[PDB]
Amino acid sequence: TYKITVRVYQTNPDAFFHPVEKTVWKYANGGTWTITDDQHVLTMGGSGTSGTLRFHADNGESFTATFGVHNYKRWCDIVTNLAADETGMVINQQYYSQKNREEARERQLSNYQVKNAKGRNFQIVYTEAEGNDLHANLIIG
Amino acid sequence: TYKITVRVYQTNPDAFFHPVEKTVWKYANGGTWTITDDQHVLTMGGSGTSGTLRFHADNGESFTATFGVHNYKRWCDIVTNLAADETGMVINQQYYSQKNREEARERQLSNYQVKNAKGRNFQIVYTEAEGNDLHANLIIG
Ligand SMILES: CC(=O)N[C@@H]1[C@@H](O)[C@H](O)[C@@H](CO)O[C@@H]1O
Ligand SMILES: CC(=O)N[C@@H]1[C@@H](O)[C@H](O)[C@@H](CO)O[C@@H]1O
C-alpha cells in the first residue's frame, strides 16, 4: 500500500478554491480518496497509479493536482487553464496515454509549481517524500 | 444548468459505506461535485453529462452510483460487484462507450435498484424528478 496525505493551504484571500472532483486511476488495484482531519488521503494498492483532485474558485479559476507513485517514488503534477471538457477524470487518465503527461509523471517530482494565465501560482511540496506514507502540501497562491 | 442533489441513506448497521471517489464526465461543459449539508451536489453545465460516486465499506463491498441528464431527462444507474480495476472514473466513462451502460443511461430512469452478490439492495429514487433542480435519495440496504 501507498498513501498520500494532502493538506491544502490557501494563502490568497482574493479567491477561495474548493474541491469539485476526486478521481482514482485503475492501475495497481485502484485506491480511494478519503478525508481525515481536513486532509485529503489517497490510498493506493501499489505503485503505478494515482488520483486527481480538481479545485474550482467562484471567479471561474480552476486546476487539477495529481498525486501518485511511479516506480516506487512519489510523483505529482498540476494542470490549470483547464478547457470546459477537461474534467479531473480526463486529466487523470491522460497521465497514462498522453506523452507530455506521462513524462511529467515519470519525473517523480516531490515538488512542483506552475501558474495559470491569470498569474496565480499553484504548488505541491511533499514534506514526507520517502517510503509508503507520503505527505504533501498543496499551496494555492 | 442541471443540478442533482443526492442524500445518502444507510439503513443497515451490518456495514458502513463511505464515498471514495467522485467523478464528472466531460460533456456539456463538465460540472462539479460539491457538498451542502452532507448532501452530494452534482452541478452540470447542461444536459448530456453525468457524474459518478463510488462508495466502499470496510467489509469489502463497493458500488458506484451515477447520476446525469440525457436529453433533458434525469438518469441513474448503480454498478455493484466491482473489479479492483473498476474505479469510479472507469465506470463513469463506460456510460458513453459500453453498450449495456449506454442503454441504462438512455432509459432515463427516475429510480433504479439492484442487489450485489451478497444480496444487499441499493436504490436511487429521484424525489424531485423533473426540471433543472433534481433531488435523489441513494438508499443502501
Ligand atoms: C499551465 C499548465 O497547466 N501547464 C501544465 C503543466 O503544469 C503540466 O506539467 C503539463 C503536463 O501534464 O501540462 C501543462 O503544460
Ligand atoms: C449487479 C450489477 O452491478 N449489475 C449491473 C446493473 O446494475 C447495471 O445497470 C449495469 C449497466 O451499467 O451493469 C451491471 O449489469
Residue numbers in the entry:
A (entry chain B), B (entry chain A): 1 to 141
Sentences from the study reporting this entry:
Sclerotium rolfsii lectin (SRL) is a cell wall-associated developmental–stage specific lectin secreted from the soil–born pathogenic fungus. SRL displays a clear specificity for TF and its substituted glycan structures. In the current study we report two recombinant variants SSR1 and SSR2, generated by the deliberate changes of the amino acids incorporated at particular sites of SRL by the synthetic gene construct method based on the complete amino acid sequence of SRL. Interestingly, SSR1 and SSR2 the two different variants of SRL, differ in their glycan specificity.
In both the SSR1-GlcNAc and the SSR2-GlcNAc complexes, determined at 1.9 Å and 1.7 Å respectively, GlcNAc was found bound only in the secondary carbohydrate binding site of SRL in agreement with the complex of GlcNAc with SRL. In the SSR1-GlcNAc structure an MPD molecule was found bound in the primary carbohydrate binding site similarly to the SRL-GlcNAc complex structure. All atoms of the ligand are well defined in both variant complexes, within the electron density map which has shown that GlcNAc binds to this site with two alternative conformations with respect to the hydroxyl group O1, α and β that have equal occupancies. The rms displacement values for all atoms upon superposition of the SSR1-GlcNAc and the SSR2-GlcNAc structures onto the SRL-GlcNAc structure are 0.5 Å and 0.4 Å, respectively. The structural mode of binding of GlcNAc does not differ significantly in the variants and the SRL structure. Briefly, GlcNAc is involved in hydrogen bond interactions with residues Asp77, Ile78, Thr80, Arg101, and Tyr112. All hydroxyl groups of GlcNAc except hydroxyl group O1, are involved in hydrogen bond interactions with protein residues, a fact that offers an explanation for the alternative conformations of this group. In both alternative conformations, the hydroxyl group O1, in the ligand complexes, is involved in hydrogen bond interactions only with water molecules. The glycan array analysis of the variants demonstrated that SSR1 recognizes TF antigen and its derivatives with high affinity like SRL but showed the highest affinity towards the sialylated Tn antigen, unlike SRL.
